[PDB]
Every structure is written in C-alpha cells, then in structure tokens.
Design a protein around this nucleic acid. Structure first.
Ligand SMILES: [Mg+2]
Ligand SMILES: [Mg+2]
Ligand SMILES: [Mg+2]
Ligand SMILES: [Mg+2]
Ligand SMILES: [Mg+2]
Ligand SMILES: [Mg+2]
Ligand SMILES: [Mg+2]
Ligand SMILES: [Mg+2]
Ligand SMILES: [Mg+2]
Ligand SMILES: [Mg+2]
Ligand SMILES: [Mg+2]
Ligand SMILES: [Mg+2]
Ligand SMILES: [Mg+2]
Ligand SMILES: [Mg+2]
Ligand SMILES: [Mg+2]
Ligand SMILES: [Mg+2]
Ligand SMILES: [Mg+2]
Ligand SMILES: [Mg+2]
Ligand SMILES: [Mg+2]
Ligand SMILES: [Mg+2]
Ligand SMILES: [Mg+2]
Ligand SMILES: [Mg+2]
Ligand SMILES: [Mg+2]
Ligand SMILES: [Mg+2]
Ligand SMILES: [Mg+2]
Ligand SMILES: [Mg+2]
Ligand SMILES: [Mg+2]
Ligand SMILES: [Mg+2]
Ligand SMILES: [Mg+2]
Ligand SMILES: [Mg+2]
Ligand SMILES: [Mg+2]
Ligand SMILES: [Mg+2]
Ligand SMILES: [Mg+2]
Ligand SMILES: [Mg+2]
Ligand SMILES: [Mg+2]
Ligand SMILES: [Mg+2]
Ligand SMILES: [Mg+2]
Ligand SMILES: [Mg+2]
Ligand SMILES: [Mg+2]
Ligand SMILES: [Mg+2]
Ligand SMILES: [Mg+2]
Ligand SMILES: [Mg+2]
Ligand SMILES: [Mg+2]
Ligand SMILES: [Mg+2]
Ligand SMILES: [Mg+2]
Ligand SMILES: [Mg+2]
Ligand SMILES: [Mg+2]
Ligand SMILES: [Mg+2]
Ligand SMILES: [Mg+2]
Ligand SMILES: [Mg+2]
Ligand SMILES: [Mg+2]
Ligand SMILES: [Mg+2]
Ligand SMILES: [Mg+2]
Ligand SMILES: [Mg+2]
Ligand SMILES: [Mg+2]
Ligand SMILES: [Mg+2]
Ligand SMILES: [Mg+2]
Ligand SMILES: [Mg+2]
Ligand SMILES: [Mg+2]
Ligand SMILES: [Mg+2]
Ligand SMILES: [Mg+2]
Ligand SMILES: [Mg+2]
Ligand SMILES: [Mg+2]
Ligand SMILES: [Mg+2]
Ligand SMILES: [Mg+2]
Ligand SMILES: [Mg+2]
Ligand SMILES: [Mg+2]
Ligand SMILES: [Mg+2]
Ligand SMILES: [Mg+2]
Ligand SMILES: [Mg+2]
Ligand SMILES: [Mg+2]
Ligand SMILES: [Mg+2]
Ligand SMILES: [Mg+2]
Ligand SMILES: [Mg+2]
Ligand SMILES: [Mg+2]
Ligand SMILES: [Mg+2]
Ligand SMILES: [Mg+2]
Ligand SMILES: [Mg+2]
Ligand SMILES: [Mg+2]
Ligand SMILES: [Mg+2]
Ligand SMILES: [Mg+2]
Ligand SMILES: [Mg+2]
Ligand SMILES: [Mg+2]
Ligand SMILES: [Mg+2]
Ligand SMILES: [Mg+2]
Ligand SMILES: [Mg+2]
Ligand SMILES: [Mg+2]
Ligand SMILES: [Mg+2]
Ligand SMILES: [Mg+2]
Ligand SMILES: [Mg+2]
Ligand SMILES: [Mg+2]
Ligand SMILES: [Mg+2]
Ligand SMILES: [Mg+2]
Ligand SMILES: [Zn+2]
Lengths: 204, 140, 174, 37, 7
RNA sequence: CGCUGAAAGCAUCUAAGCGGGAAGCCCGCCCCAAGAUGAGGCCUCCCACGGCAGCCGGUAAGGACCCGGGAAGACCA
RNA sequence: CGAUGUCGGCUCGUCGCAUCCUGGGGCUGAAGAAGGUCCCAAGGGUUGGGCUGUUCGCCCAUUAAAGCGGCACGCGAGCUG
C-alpha cells in the first residue's frame, strides 16, 4: 500500500499500439517523509508526506519546529498515506510502474449552489403543455399527513462539488522520473493545479 | 421539623467484577449504587451516589438463547436505517456496551440520570485505569 | 434395550483416562479426546470402561447412551481405526492420488483435488475405489461425505460417487 | 418438500421427527418429505 | 376564481 | 443438505457436539464524521508578566481586521 | 360542512412481500434442454410505443423481467386540468 502527493497538470492523449489513449498528467514527486505514525506512538501505520517547497520566511514557528525534527525544508502541504512505510526518506514517482492500477483522490470542481437537475439528474418539469414556473423544479418532496415529514438524505438543491472524490483503478500509462511525471489513463477529479493523491489500487 | 438534607457528600468509588454474573441482575444493583439509594441520606435531586468501576464486563452471563435472540437496535433517522445487532455480535465487537445499555435503561431519564450514567466506568478484561481513586471492591 | 449400560471392552493395551468433562483415549494408532457431560460418570474397570447416569430424567438417559458410544467409538478408533470406501461409477470417471491429495476426474471441465485433513489418509487401490482412513470416526464420515458430494449418485444412471454398499436405485427415462 | 399445516404419515415407511422446533416427516419416498409450516 | 368545487 | 449420535439395542441433521449452504446479513469499497459534551490521539510552538478556578492592563506563540485575487463562493465560509 | 380540494397524469421518492426477474433450495408424471409446484430471499432491477381523460385493459416491438399492493385511491401552499 503505497501513495504519493501530486498535482494535476492537464489532459492529453498519447498513442499506444495504434490506439489513442486519453491521459491525465500528474506531477507527483518528490515527497519527503516528514513524520512516521507508528502503532507504538499513534496507534496506526502511515507516513506523513510533504509536497512543494514553501518560502521559509512564510512558515510559522509551530510548523518550523515540526519540519526541524525531520530535517526537511518547509513544504507547502502535508498529507498522510495510511498503511505505508517506505524504506527511504523521499517518495518519488518510481514507486509506480507502467501497467499498475492506481486510485486517485482530488477535490471535484465546485458547482456552487446547484439545482436539483444539475446536482441529482432530476427530470424537472415540462417546458410547455401548461407547465407553470416549475420547469426545473423537483416536484413532490413527500407524502401527506403520514409521515407528515421529509426523509433525511432527501435529494434537494444545495452546494455540489468541491468535495473529496476518489476515482479508482486507473491504469498507469507512463512514468517519467526525470520530470516527476505520472501519466494515468482517463479522468481525475478537480482542476488543473489541484492537489491529488495517487495510491495503489484496492480493486483486485 | 424539616427533613435532613446533606451537604455535598464525598463520593465513594467501588469496584465490581462482572465475571459470571447475570446481565440484568447485576445492572439492577449498579443502578441502585449510582442512584445512591443504599445511603441513609439519599436525596432524589443530587448526584450523591457512588462511582462504580466494573471489570470483566465481557464475561457477563445471560440465560436462555439471548446470545442469538437478544437484538439491540439503533435507528439513524434515514429511510431504512433501523440496524439490528444481536447480543453475540455486540459482545464480539463492543462488549462493554452490553452492561452499559442495561444499566442505562434502569437509570432515571433526564439531566440527573444522564450524569449518574457518567459515574459508571465499564471495562472489558480484568484491568481498569482508576487506580488513582483506590476503589473499594464490592461483592455483589 | 440400553446402549449406555453396556460396558465398553478395552483392548490391551489401550489406555482410558478420566478427567472433568473429558476422557482421554490413547491407543496404538493415536489418541482422541471425548468431551463428556459432567452429569455422567465414567468409571474405569479391568479392561472395561463403564458409564453411569445420575437419574432417569430424559436428559440423563439421552446423554447416557450418547456418552457410552462416544467412548466406545474412540476406543475402537485408537486400536482398529475407522475407514470408509467409496466407489466411482460411470464411463469416464476415475481417481488417483497426487501426493497425499485426492484427485477426482468425474465429468467436469476440470479435475477436483481433495486435500486430506489432519488425521485422514487417502488411498486409491483401483482407479474406481477410494478409501478414507483415520482414527476419528466422525471425521472419517465427514471427509467421505465431502468427497461423495463432488459428484453424487445420479438418479437415472449408475454414475457418480457411491458409498461402498450403497444401493443403486434408479428411475426410468422415457 | 411438501410444506403444510397438516403433516401426516403417508405410508408405513414414513417417520415423523422433530428437529429445531419444527415437525418433519422423513421417508424413503422423496414425495413424502414434509415440513410443517 | 372561487371555491374548490367539491361536488 | 449433511457427519457423528442417544432418548427408543434399530432409526433419526439434534436432544451433547461438528460440517455445508443465498443477488440477502456483518465486515470489506467510496463519502461524511470527536457538538462521539463519551467533546479522543500524535507532532510542533508560546509560557511561569505586571496590580485589590477570580481580576484588569501590556505581551507571547499565534489569530483577526484591511487589501490583491481564486475552476472557492448567494452573503458567510 | 366559521372547507380535511375531489379522478387521472407528470415529478419525487419510500415501504410491505402474498416474489415478476436476478441468487439459494426441495419435490416432479425431473433423460438433457426447457418447464411445473412449493420453500428461502425485498439487495438491485422491473423497457419504448398504438388506443382511451382514463385507473384498468387490449394491441405492437422488445425483455432477465416487463410483479402486486401501502404511504389521505402517497404527492394540486410541487405542476397539469
Ligand atoms: Mg485546457
Ligand atoms: Mg507506452
Ligand atoms: Mg493549510
Ligand atoms: Mg486534497
Ligand atoms: Mg475545487
Ligand atoms: Mg466537471
Ligand atoms: Mg462555482
Ligand atoms: Mg433544477
Ligand atoms: Mg449532473
Ligand atoms: Mg443534467
Ligand atoms: Mg450530478
Ligand atoms: Mg423529463
Ligand atoms: Mg419526464
Ligand atoms: Mg426537460
Ligand atoms: Mg419554458
Ligand atoms: Mg394555468
Ligand atoms: Mg397559471
Ligand atoms: Mg408555480
Ligand atoms: Mg413557463
Ligand atoms: Mg416542486
Ligand atoms: Mg395536507
Ligand atoms: Mg393531497
Ligand atoms: Mg409523523
Ligand atoms: Mg463547498
Ligand atoms: Mg477493467
Ligand atoms: Mg517537472
Ligand atoms: Mg483536485
Ligand atoms: Mg492549494
Ligand atoms: Mg431534621
Ligand atoms: Mg449480580
Ligand atoms: Mg445519585
Ligand atoms: Mg440522587
Ligand atoms: Mg444464550
Ligand atoms: Mg418517570
Ligand atoms: Mg457436505
Ligand atoms: Mg392432506
Ligand atoms: Mg429414512
Ligand atoms: Mg448416522
Ligand atoms: Mg444409534
Ligand atoms: Mg445442538
Ligand atoms: Mg453450520
Ligand atoms: Mg459458511
Ligand atoms: Mg454481484
Ligand atoms: Mg475526512
Ligand atoms: Mg475535539
Ligand atoms: Mg477529525
Ligand atoms: Mg462533559
Ligand atoms: Mg456534559
Ligand atoms: Mg450517546
Ligand atoms: Mg471530559
Ligand atoms: Mg482535541
Ligand atoms: Mg487513538
Ligand atoms: Mg466569500
Ligand atoms: Mg469575492
Ligand atoms: Mg463575496
Ligand atoms: Mg467582512
Ligand atoms: Mg365538510
Ligand atoms: Mg376559520
Ligand atoms: Mg378552522
Ligand atoms: Mg377555510
Ligand atoms: Mg384550511
Ligand atoms: Mg411527461
Ligand atoms: Mg410505490
Ligand atoms: Mg416468502
Ligand atoms: Mg429465482
Ligand atoms: Mg432459481
Ligand atoms: Mg424448482
Ligand atoms: Mg424430457
Ligand atoms: Mg433440467
Ligand atoms: Mg417446499
Ligand atoms: Mg428485492
Ligand atoms: Mg421491488
Ligand atoms: Mg399517431
Ligand atoms: Mg398514450
Ligand atoms: Mg391507458
Ligand atoms: Mg377500460
Ligand atoms: Mg417472457
Ligand atoms: Mg427467461
Ligand atoms: Mg408498457
Ligand atoms: Mg400501488
Ligand atoms: Mg407498485
Ligand atoms: Mg390506509
Ligand atoms: Mg380506496
Ligand atoms: Mg383509482
Ligand atoms: Mg374511491
Ligand atoms: Mg391521489
Ligand atoms: Mg393528489
Ligand atoms: Mg392547483
Ligand atoms: Mg390532482
Ligand atoms: Mg398538498
Ligand atoms: Mg395546500
Ligand atoms: Mg397543505
Ligand atoms: Mg375541463
Ligand atoms: Zn412414506
């Protein structure tokens, strides 16, 4: 169980065996090891990784001390990969080989306050035939006096996206260690520039 | 001539070992002790009972086929969110909840009753961390 | 009219030792351990094991006969041993030992390998005869039952896996 | 398996048994298998 | 309008 | 559907014991989640300031205000 | 009765199981394939049209299947009319 912190660059397609393969390009490494959660100290196993250097004259004293105890320069981000104990002190793209399958976690693009048709694929109303100001409305939200209420988890309008999403079992199309590049076939959550996490797959 | 009312009492810490005892018949006594009704100065509107530590709560005992047929349930508020957990699985997973549920169902409802529940410290296995309080062992 | 009153002959030199809620039986072929109701009494006599029951309520009478046979089956298990033979029938059906495991060719697209659990020994005299050997009678019957269910007797043809002595009952086809 | 409220012996080889709180009829004739229910 | 015509 | 097995010399999946067995049940996958007031855990930073569990002033590590913005967003965040 | 809006549709679900399909079984007048009947099972699924205001139903072309019922004949301070 291995992971790395990353950055979604953008999409393209490459050509492999006379097939066009859409890819998302991710800048993964290098991720220095900042803290090691152990069963003795913390109750579980995990590495705290770091990612992207930060202006040392921009990192407050509580974080300065934390980096110091590891002997690492200030990084912009800390994230834990759970159940990962890499041998070295720096995780790079070369933990992945082409052909391996990975799960990728990013923050979806935010639709803001979203209607029931965009958020939940509701059917809306008719656009003619007498329909009266309900073309995008959800219709009924319940029954009558029994139960006289609205279910919890009811699908309604509200904020949509800008949430944690994991897409699973993406094929690794290439590793370019000279540039810390990881090509993964298909779509990855979030905008270009967004932070993402690449873990070995959990599908068998 | 006005009934006596005690000034704030200094609570006693007692220790009960649940191993082999019958689940309900022991809860009933822990309820009494938490309410402090064994005390001749009992007052219905103050927390003045004992603190009760319990060890070996996973070795509680039960009659009949209750290990398979006793069903704790939780309702989440969502359509279909009625969860059914048999006693067997609860002892297998969160054993201390078994005596806790039974004691709590015998305490009074309301603010005081929730506080006296906080005066119960239920533990699986023989050990307990309250050595600081030096709890008097009780043969119940 | 009573299983449990029947004394249990003990062959030389099979040892029977009594303990709370157990008896241990050690013989030439190994040792078994029979868990016995604390309500029954297991008394050791000269080359004879006997079982006594405390009253005549039904639970005592039911454990009484049960217990004796459990002691007896184990005393035979550690000296004579138990075994069941299985017959394979059908045109393409046979078996063979592959190491200690049991390989079955019984009409699927694949073979069926059966490993022998601890205490059980597999034997294939003829390609159509399988022998399940062990000291534990219940365990021998279970493993034989397991092997039989891989291709049970057909209802219309004499093909599949049969217990030795199992009758071949069939029913017509047209 | 016949499942019904009246479970009887059908033939002289039929045997009425009781297992796990339910009344069964077992017999050499598979048509005669009964469970009360 | 008027009333719901419950007729 | 069994194995072994009495009560009931036989028989019996059961009364003691042990197997096998569903798109269902529990866990496993994804998401939220310590207001879980039972308010958890780990890493790091500041520190015993001055005047009659309190008190009011100046600080500390830190934070907010303000501003330039943002595939974040109704405002807020 | 100083008003509890009344059919059907659309939208949005949710529940029961006496189960339509899918999973597990027994019996069969079960050769196989395919069925029949009963048992367990409510996780998920259960199509698009012609006619009629229709519910229902019949028809067309499919389908693993085109289930049956409850929620004020669920849902008009949500729409239609
Ligand atoms: Mg672009
Ligand atoms: Mg290539
Ligand atoms: Mg931050
Ligand atoms: Mg992130
Ligand atoms: Mg975003
Ligand atoms: Mg998008
Ligand atoms: Mg937006
Ligand atoms: Mg909408
Ligand atoms: Mg959408
Ligand atoms: Mg849409
Ligand atoms: Mg959507
Ligand atoms: Mg529509
Ligand atoms: Mg529509
Ligand atoms: Mg539309
Ligand atoms: Mg319009
Ligand atoms: Mg209008
Ligand atoms: Mg209008
Ligand atoms: Mg309107
Ligand atoms: Mg309009
Ligand atoms: Mg609406
Ligand atoms: Mg109403
Ligand atoms: Mg209404
Ligand atoms: Mg209500
Ligand atoms: Mg948001
Ligand atoms: Mg694939
Ligand atoms: Mg680069
Ligand atoms: Mg992202
Ligand atoms: Mg960022
Ligand atoms: Mg007085
Ligand atoms: Mg007691
Ligand atoms: Mg009290
Ligand atoms: Mg009191
Ligand atoms: Mg029990
Ligand atoms: Mg009351
Ligand atoms: Mg079997
Ligand atoms: Mg009849
Ligand atoms: Mg028979
Ligand atoms: Mg038998
Ligand atoms: Mg017998
Ligand atoms: Mg039993
Ligand atoms: Mg079993
Ligand atoms: Mg199993
Ligand atoms: Mg599946
Ligand atoms: Mg989270
Ligand atoms: Mg907290
Ligand atoms: Mg948290
Ligand atoms: Mg508190
Ligand atoms: Mg509190
Ligand atoms: Mg609570
Ligand atoms: Mg606290
Ligand atoms: Mg905290
Ligand atoms: Mg912890
Ligand atoms: Mg804002
Ligand atoms: Mg703005
Ligand atoms: Mg704004
Ligand atoms: Mg402001
Ligand atoms: Mg009226
Ligand atoms: Mg009025
Ligand atoms: Mg009125
Ligand atoms: Mg009115
Ligand atoms: Mg009104
Ligand atoms: Mg429509
Ligand atoms: Mg419905
Ligand atoms: Mg049913
Ligand atoms: Mg089916
Ligand atoms: Mg079927
Ligand atoms: Mg059938
Ligand atoms: Mg035929
Ligand atoms: Mg067939
Ligand atoms: Mg049936
Ligand atoms: Mg279902
Ligand atoms: Mg359904
Ligand atoms: Mg037309
Ligand atoms: Mg039409
Ligand atoms: Mg019609
Ligand atoms: Mg009609
Ligand atoms: Mg059909
Ligand atoms: Mg079909
Ligand atoms: Mg139709
Ligand atoms: Mg209906
Ligand atoms: Mg329906
Ligand atoms: Mg009704
Ligand atoms: Mg009606
Ligand atoms: Mg109607
Ligand atoms: Mg009517
Ligand atoms: Mg209606
Ligand atoms: Mg209506
Ligand atoms: Mg209206
Ligand atoms: Mg209407
Ligand atoms: Mg209404
Ligand atoms: Mg209204
Ligand atoms: Mg209303
Ligand atoms: Mg009109
Ligand atoms: Zn019969």
């Amino acid at each position: 169980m291995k992971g790395i912190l990353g950055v979604k660059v953008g999409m393209t397609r490459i050509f492999r065996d006379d097939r066009a393969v859409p890819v998302t390009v991710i800048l993964a490494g290098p991720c220095p090891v900042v803290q090691r959660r152990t069963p003795e100290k913390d109750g579980y196993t995990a590495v705290q990784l770091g990612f992207l250097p930060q202006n040392p004259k921009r990192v407050n004293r509580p974080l300065k001390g934390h980096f110091a105890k590891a002997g690492v320069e200030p990084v912009r981000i800390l994230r834990e990969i759970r159940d990962f104990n890499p041998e070295g002190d720096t995780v790079t793209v070369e933990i992945f080989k082409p052909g391996e399958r990975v799960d990728v976690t990013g923050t979806s693009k935010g639709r803001g306050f979203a209607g029931v048709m965009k958020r939940w694929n509701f059917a809306g109303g008719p656009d003619s035939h007498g329909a009266h100001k309900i073309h995008r409305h959800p219709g009924s939200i319940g029954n009558r006096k029994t139960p006289g209420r609205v279910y919890k988890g009811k699908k309604m309008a509200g904020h949509y996206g800008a949430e944690r999403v994991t897409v699973m079992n993406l094929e690794v199309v290439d590793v370019i260690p000279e540039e810390n590049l990881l090509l993964v076939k298909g779509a990855v959550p979030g905008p270009n520039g967004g932070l993402v996490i690449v873990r070995e797959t959990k599908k068998a | 001539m006005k009934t006596y009312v005690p000034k704030q009492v200094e609570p006693r810490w007692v220790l009960i070992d649940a191993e082999g005892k019958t689940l309900g018949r022991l809860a009933t006594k822990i309820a009494t002790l938490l309410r402090g009704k064994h005390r001749p100065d009992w007052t219905p509107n103050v927390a003045m009972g004992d603190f009760v530590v319990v060890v070996n709560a996973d070795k509680i005992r039960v009659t009949g086929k209750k290990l398979e047929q006793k069903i704790y349930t939780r309702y989440s508020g969502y359509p279909g969110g009625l969860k059914k957990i048999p006693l067997e699985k609860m002892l297998a997973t969160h054993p201390e909840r078994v005596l806790e549920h039974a004691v709590k169902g015998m305490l009074p409802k309301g603010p005081l009753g929730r506080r006296l529940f906080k005066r119960l410290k239920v533990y699986a296995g023989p050990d307990h961390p309250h050595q600081a309080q030096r709890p008097e062992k009780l043969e119940v | 009219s009573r299983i449990g009153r029947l004394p249990i002959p003990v062959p030389k030199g099979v040892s029977v030792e009594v303990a709370p809620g157990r008896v241990k039986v050690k013989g030439p072929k190994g040792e078994l351990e029979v868990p016995v109701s604390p309500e029954m009494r297991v008394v050791v006599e000269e080359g004879v094991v006997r079982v006594e029951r405390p009253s005549d309520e039904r639970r005592h009478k039911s454990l009484h006969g049960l217990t004796r046979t459990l002691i007896a089956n184990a005393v035979k298990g550690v000296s004579e041993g138990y075994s069941k033979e299985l017959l394979i029938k059908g045109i393409g059906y046979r078996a063979r030992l592959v190491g200690r495991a049991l390989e079955l060719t019984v009409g699927f697209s694949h073979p069926v390998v059966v490993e022998p659990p601890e205490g059980i020994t597999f034997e294939v005299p003829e390609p159509t005869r399988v022998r399940v050997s062990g000291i534990d009678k219940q365990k021998v019957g279970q493993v034989a039952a397991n092997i039989r269910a891989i291709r049970k007797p057909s209802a219309y043809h004499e093909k599949g896996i049969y217990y030795a002595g199992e009758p071949v009952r069939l029913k017509p086809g047209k | 398996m016949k499942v019904r409220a009246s479970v009887k012996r059908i033939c002289d080889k039929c045997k009425v048994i009781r297992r796990h709180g339910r009344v069964y009829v077992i017999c050499e004739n598979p048509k005669h298998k009964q469970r009360q229910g | 309008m008027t009333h719901s015509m419950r007729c």
